[PDB]
Design an enzyme around this catalytic site. Sequence first.
Site, PDB file in Angstrom:
ATOM      1  N   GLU A  49      63.398 -58.189 -24.786  1.00 47.70           N
ATOM      2  CA  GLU A  49      62.590 -58.302 -23.188  1.00 47.70           C
ATOM      3  C   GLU A  49      61.509 -57.314 -23.319  1.00 47.70           C
ATOM      4  O   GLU A  49      60.835 -57.494 -22.494  1.00 47.70           O
ATOM      5  CB  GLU A  49      63.771 -58.175 -22.291  1.00 47.70           C
ATOM      6  N   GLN A  51      54.397 -37.270 -42.129  1.00 41.82           N
ATOM      7  CA  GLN A  51      54.360 -35.882 -41.779  1.00 41.82           C
ATOM      8  C   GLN A  51      54.878 -36.017 -39.905  1.00 41.82           C
ATOM      9  O   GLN A  51      55.741 -35.520 -39.521  1.00 41.82           O
ATOM     10  CB  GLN A  51      53.421 -35.140 -41.833  1.00 41.82           C
ATOM     11  N   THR A  96      42.101 -34.122 -37.468  1.00 39.99           N
ATOM     12  CA  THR A  96      42.341 -33.044 -38.644  1.00 39.99           C
ATOM     13  C   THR A  96      42.443 -33.618 -40.093  1.00 39.99           C
ATOM     14  O   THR A  96      43.066 -33.541 -40.885  1.00 39.99           O
ATOM     15  CB  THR A  96      43.415 -32.510 -38.236  1.00 39.99           C
ATOM     16  N   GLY A 103      47.371 -40.427 -45.376  1.00 38.93           N
ATOM     17  CA  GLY A 103      48.162 -41.269 -46.493  1.00 38.93           C
ATOM     18  C   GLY A 103      49.440 -41.297 -45.924  1.00 38.93           C
ATOM     19  O   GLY A 103      49.857 -41.011 -44.668  1.00 38.93           O
TER      20      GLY A 103
END
Lengths: 428, 428, 49, 426, 426
Positions: B245, B11, B170, B135
Amino acid sequence: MREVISIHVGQAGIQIGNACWELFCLEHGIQPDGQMPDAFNTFFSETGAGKHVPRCVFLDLEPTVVDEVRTGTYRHLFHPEQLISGKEDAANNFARGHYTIGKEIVDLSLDRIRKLADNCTGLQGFLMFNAVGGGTGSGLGCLLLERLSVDYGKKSKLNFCSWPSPQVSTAVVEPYNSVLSTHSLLEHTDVAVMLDNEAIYDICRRNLDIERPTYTNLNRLIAQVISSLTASLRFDGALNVDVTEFQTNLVPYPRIHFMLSSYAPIISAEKAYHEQLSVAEITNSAFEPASMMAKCDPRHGKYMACCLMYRGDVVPKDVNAAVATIKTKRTIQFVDWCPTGFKCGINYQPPTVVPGGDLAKVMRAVCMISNSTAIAEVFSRMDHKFDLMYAKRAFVHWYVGEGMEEGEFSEAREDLAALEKDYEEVGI
Amino acid sequence: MREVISIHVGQAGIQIGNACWELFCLEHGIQPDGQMPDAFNTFFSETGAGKHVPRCVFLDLEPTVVDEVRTGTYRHLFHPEQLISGKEDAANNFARGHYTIGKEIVDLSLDRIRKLADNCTGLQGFLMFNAVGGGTGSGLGCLLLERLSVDYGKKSKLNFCSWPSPQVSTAVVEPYNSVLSTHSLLEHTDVAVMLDNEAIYDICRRNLDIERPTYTNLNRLIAQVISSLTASLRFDGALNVDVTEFQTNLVPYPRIHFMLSSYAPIISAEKAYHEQLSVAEITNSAFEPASMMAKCDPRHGKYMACCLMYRGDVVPKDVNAAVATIKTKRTIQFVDWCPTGFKCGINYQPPTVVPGGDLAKVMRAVCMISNSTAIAEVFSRMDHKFDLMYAKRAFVHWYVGEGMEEGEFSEAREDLAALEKDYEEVGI
Amino acid sequence: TSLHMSKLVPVTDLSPRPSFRYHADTGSLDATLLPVDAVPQERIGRRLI
Amino acid sequence: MREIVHVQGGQCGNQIGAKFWEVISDEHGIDPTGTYCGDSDLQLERINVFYNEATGGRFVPRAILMDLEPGTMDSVRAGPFGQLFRPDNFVFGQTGAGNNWAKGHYTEGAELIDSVLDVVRKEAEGCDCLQGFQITHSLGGGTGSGMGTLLISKVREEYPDRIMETFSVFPSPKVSDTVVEPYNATLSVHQLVENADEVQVIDNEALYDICFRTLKLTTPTYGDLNHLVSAAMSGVTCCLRFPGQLNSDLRKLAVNLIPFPRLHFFLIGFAPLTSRGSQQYRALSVPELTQQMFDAKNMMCASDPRHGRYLTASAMFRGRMSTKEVDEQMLNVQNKNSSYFVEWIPNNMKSSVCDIPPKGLKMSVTFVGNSTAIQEMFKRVSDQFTAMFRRKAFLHWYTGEGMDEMEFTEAESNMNDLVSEYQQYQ
Amino acid sequence: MREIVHVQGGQCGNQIGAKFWEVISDEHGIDPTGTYCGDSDLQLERINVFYNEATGGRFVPRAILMDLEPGTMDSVRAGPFGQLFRPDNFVFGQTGAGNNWAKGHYTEGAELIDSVLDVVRKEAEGCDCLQGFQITHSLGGGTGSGMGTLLISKVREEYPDRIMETFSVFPSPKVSDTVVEPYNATLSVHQLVENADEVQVIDNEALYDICFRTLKLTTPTYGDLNHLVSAAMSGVTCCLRFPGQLNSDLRKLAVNLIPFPRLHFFLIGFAPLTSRGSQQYRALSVPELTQQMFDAKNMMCASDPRHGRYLTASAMFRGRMSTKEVDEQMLNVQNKNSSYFVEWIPNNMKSSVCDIPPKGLKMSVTFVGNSTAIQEMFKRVSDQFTAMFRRKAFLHWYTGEGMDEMEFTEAESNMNDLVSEYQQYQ
Ligand SMILES: Nc1nc2c(ncn2[C@@H]2O[C@H](COP(=O)(O)OP(=O)(O)OP(=O)(O)O)[C@@H](O)[C@H]2O)c(=O)[nH]1
Ligand SMILES: Nc1nc2c(ncn2[C@@H]2O[C@H](COP(=O)(O)OP(=O)(O)OP(=O)(O)O)[C@@H](O)[C@H]2O)c(=O)[nH]1
Ligand SMILES: Nc1nc2c(ncn2[C@@H]2O[C@H](COP(=O)(O)OP(=O)(O)O)[C@@H](O)[C@H]2O)c(=O)[nH]1
Ligand SMILES: Nc1nc2c(ncn2[C@@H]2O[C@H](COP(=O)(O)OP(=O)(O)O)[C@@H](O)[C@H]2O)c(=O)[nH]1
Ligand SMILES: [Mg+2]
Ligand SMILES: [Mg+2]
């Protein structure tokens, strides 16, 4: 490269600073938005698009007096978080601005003081405005001067006190806050300048014929003094007196550093055009023992140094002959370890007048800032104020309530008693 | 041909990629249909006559985020088969996104890795954007970084992870997902930039002074960072810092590759014209300890190799003077084994604005990908998050019920524990 | 390059603004002989009937 | 009719050498599309040295551009005076070799030296004697120091008696970008001391210092830092292209500045250099031009010659001069400053008067001085190298591309040897 | 030939030397630009004594203007006749030495003075001989006397045979500003007596007495005062600058005025001086010139010679004149006035004749006089010093940066024994 940061702390510090930055913007040409239509880098920087922001850091614990500035006409002038605010006031309490809630505004004020000093190549003075005899201009002012000394070594920190008037105060804790302030304006300040509101009241009545002045007219006289103090620092002059010159020709000892100022072409518009305000005339009025901006008659003391700041179309021979005239005068008494005591300065740019202000256009100026053994009566007057109150522990339970050590009143009293003994022994 | 593939998993990965592809389309002039009215080659192909299809694989295990992009204003901009959508989510469960649900969706997504790599000549790396705090981003983040390390395991892997936040959070199983992600982030990752949540929240407090901004405003600030990472690839520059770099001057040992971001100035329309924002001042605010997008104080840590990405009208001397003043500052403490440590690059292109965004027209901006030993305590708080929950096997019956053996908790805990031991011995 | 292409004398040449305005200078009542100048005079005497 | 093959390598070397090809094109009348513009024979007869002859008619430069990133050579091509260059001498590479001496010397640049050396051969055997290989490259990056070290090695084994100059820029102590710069210098000096005749040492702090305290430039840039280098390189090879009272080519410079072959890291300089008001206010006498060579301010090294002893010093004078004041200005500086000059050489000096000055000026000097005071350059590079190598910082991207740690210990052993023989020679 | 290096220190020195370069340039026919604008070989042949030559004319003054505050040198630059100086002949300085001898002599001046002797050195051995140094400075000020007198010792120890001729403005006690005048003056005279050759005491107060009483200037500005001193400054260096029947360099003045090793504080008076409308009435014969230069109103130092004697005097005349009219006037002042002339020396006066008068005036006189009446202000500034120093006046701003209290008592002791040395011959 020359540059001065102003730090206006308290209600009186902010309100004096409103008059100062109003006069400075009207003098260098910066409009209230910042644009003018390099004689400005002492008080302004340059964003790049013709934009000029004042070099000031406003402090208060109330939001009331500083929300006024950010909602009035000078809101797009200042950078929007230069105007540093808190939530609740110290409530005329020295320990409430020092040992409690004004300890979370200090880390944000010193944050922006560093941001306003690292963008300037060569700092010559931390101009500071306080209101000694209060809660935030005394408590937060004391902690700020201690913090500015430890972070910024040397770097002479000027100060324009608003020391309470001897016989009228508009408080009762005002004896306490001023005596508690002598542990900051004696060993952290170099340029402790003593201004009382009663003396400038009397100046407004006797000179300007204003029988009912408000605090704005009080601040307009003070702002002209600070502009003439920084006049050589911004404009060219025949004899330039910068900040480094000031702490060599007006301070004999590191403890005796307390000055009194008296501007004196302070003439109303009606009475300006009935005398020539010649160089001798404006310095004879400068040495009067009534135009002094602290209630302190210099005749019952002894001058030890005088720094005069003749500004305008002032010819150096007229500076020199007027200094000879006041040397001949017997009413003043210069101390015996001082054959010459008359550091003079000349700046060609004449003093400005704000349109709608209480002053008048004048071709000449004198700003007379002097050290004397007469300021001892000022501190000994509030010595009597303190010991009448502290004799049976008045208002001390609400200073020790928030963390003030019971006893900090006492060595504040021997700090004032130490300088009382010092002023009498430098006049023998 | 210079090009790079941007993976977006989770998400957070898709929604950060929405702000990234909005900003990349604005800079290159490519409209939301693809038709613009050789700078584009890093992020867009040359399909059709003017159809610049973006170079990304949008992957998530839900329908909800991906199909809404497929029904958004950027519908016919992406190749719609690049938007691989899952069918059921990983449900904040690393076992679901790595063993059961993710064992099918990776096969289709890696098929678009094959076509996006065969479409291009001279591939440089993989800008993977994933959350770690749940997840999908941790599960598919593990599985994609594993199999991409065996068939494309010779190229760079720039993974801009979103580590769990210290205080606000959360999800409650969130400590489990990120302890069970350092088993892939430690070795199947070339650069692992750690981005946080309060760290963009409080940049939004003090700098943008937005009282209530959204995840979109977080993603816009991250997008401006990413456009400064790969700024010398698409555009020109005095000192160009390509993708090899950012990692040959920043990664001292193969395990220490967890760097931190610092954009400056994240400034609004108010304060932009009130300051003179220039090369010296911008890097002083970039080294401000709260300007990290990590909530990771660099003062109780210490630097090892810092990289600066000056962008806009920046002259190389002013990089040099500002790097010198940063070096002379005492609170910024580098390491004994790096007398150097300021990999500076300059882009001629000024940073863009999103119209109706949160950022003002600023000429100069510095991004700072810095490697210090302070990152160790970011993992040390999450180690403490792990062992209260794993003290009596909380929330384990879904991790073990979906296919994992129970020992993977202790194996990932000791692997993460050896990481802070490595970060402690690197700075003796 | 701000430098001259063969002379190595930079060509932009700048113009830094004066810090003060730098005015009100001199010019002297004396005029190149150490005498005086012929400014307008005054009478500062009685009324001359 | 002696030739110089000029090879520019690295991003820094390509930018420095592109500034060289415009300060020698206006010095020879070459238009950006190669056509002589004036009518002077003295500006054209020795065009064979740095230019070729085309059947089109244009004098293409004998330049070989050389950089694994195809972005800097796009800038050189699209810039002014970039249309002179032959497109065949644009050997590209598409990988980057980013700030890695291991990638520049052993990894990816290894299958590019077999193509740049074909371009070198196509330019080199086109004559009957080559004078030198003027090579400009950086020592702080990957493409510059790495494949630069490849090209200096294979050119020397093919050509054993040909000169090869090296206007190489060294890593900078005060502020520098690349973190692995001490690694990129210590591993490059080892081959720059055994396959090189002349290495004109250039830094970046003193080039900034020149445009801060001789020119008072409030706005320098990387272009005008390169225009100082290009002016110095022009005056060194001036006698090969222009007639003079006392001609002295590049080999004359070599044989009269090196006591013993390893001690060949010189200091470059250029000393007419005026300020803004000080263009009208500066005399153009020979003694004043001698004054501005022997100042630490106008040295392109920041490795102060006062802290050291001049082993040998030479000055390539240019312009309409008196052949006597060119020498007792060297004699007076050796006598009024005698403790700053090595005692076992009387006449530590060379003067060489060419007769063609740079355009606009009346005279010019380019100082090339072998000093003890290049000790300071190598000892602080050793200080930056040892501090990281003692804890093996960033080592595994030099071993990973294929090396071993003894190559680092030998590279520091050669350069800690390099501070040693300069030390008893003081 | 002969060369003078003019160094101006502080606000007073920079503004008094800027008028000097205005009146020398008027004498030599040089614009504010710096080109000659006449036809006279005599006006141009002895120009190397004060001006150098740079390519296309541009006669630049040999001026080493130097200050610790960037306020007064820019005022010289913006004014007329102010672009003549080189931009690098301006040793700048930020912050400032605000009325402190120590802030110019121990800290804040020691860092800058390294660069000052660099600019001095380029303008010292840029020629063949050197007569000496003209040093205008201010004792009554911090940055003027601090690095001012420090430079006096530095260029003495570098060149201990050149004439160290110094014009200094002593702080007269009666009507003058700044309170630290006793501390600056007493500390600076101590350094000034074993390091300077010809100290010319030129007070501001006595210059005002010249303006009010002799010239009758209604408003004498500071440009008026500096115009008088620049005239005396041109009249003393005349014979290095213009031919004459009897010539007298600066080394003539030091030998024929100084009887004993210290004894070098002279009094100057310049006099074709006339009232406002009195140009139509004054004569310009030698007897009125002699009667005017001996008038005590015509002293630049208010140290009245009738309160003392004349140890040895000198009058450098200028203009076309007869030698006996000089001689009989120089003898008649000795025969008529005999009390204020010392007896153990015969013939207590030299004379010289420049045949080139100042611009416009037919005849002129400068009168440098070693008088044993300068001790009147060696007592005046000492009484001001000890009145402060007894009860511990301004000293914490003179101690915390490095001086101890013993340097103050030793500076007053050298003041006191030089008072006693002048009182010896009275
Ligand atoms: N000069 C000047 N003094 C003022 C002004 N307003 C108030 N004062 C003085 O300030 C003294 C008390 O201080 P405050 O005005 O309360 O400000 P303060 O000391 O910072 O205390 P706070 O209320 O906590 O802000 C009074 O005795 C007033 O005489 C003003 O506008 N100008
Ligand atoms: N920076 C940033 N972080 C986000 C955003 N949205 C969610 N997150 C973070 O992502 C973590 C949860 O994982 P998500 O990315 O939201 O969802 P997921 O990774 O796809 O996992 P599933 O919900 O199981 O599919 C939270 O802890 C958030 O902190 C966002 O828009 N911006
Ligand atoms: N004088 C000069 N130096 C440069 C220029 N470009 C890069 N540099 C220097 O080179 C260093 C960067 O490494 P670089 O030369 O680009 O590595 P390379 O790609 O291997 O050649 C910096 O420290 C710069 O000081 C240039 O145009 N002029
Ligand atoms: N003759 C002359 N005297 C000056 C001038 N300016 C200031 N003074 C005198 O010098 C004294 C102050 O010296 P000051 O300028 O402070 O010296 P400084 O700042 O240390 O260089 C004053 O008493 C003035 O009378 C000037 O331009 N000319
Ligand atoms: Mg209040
Ligand atoms: Mg999700």
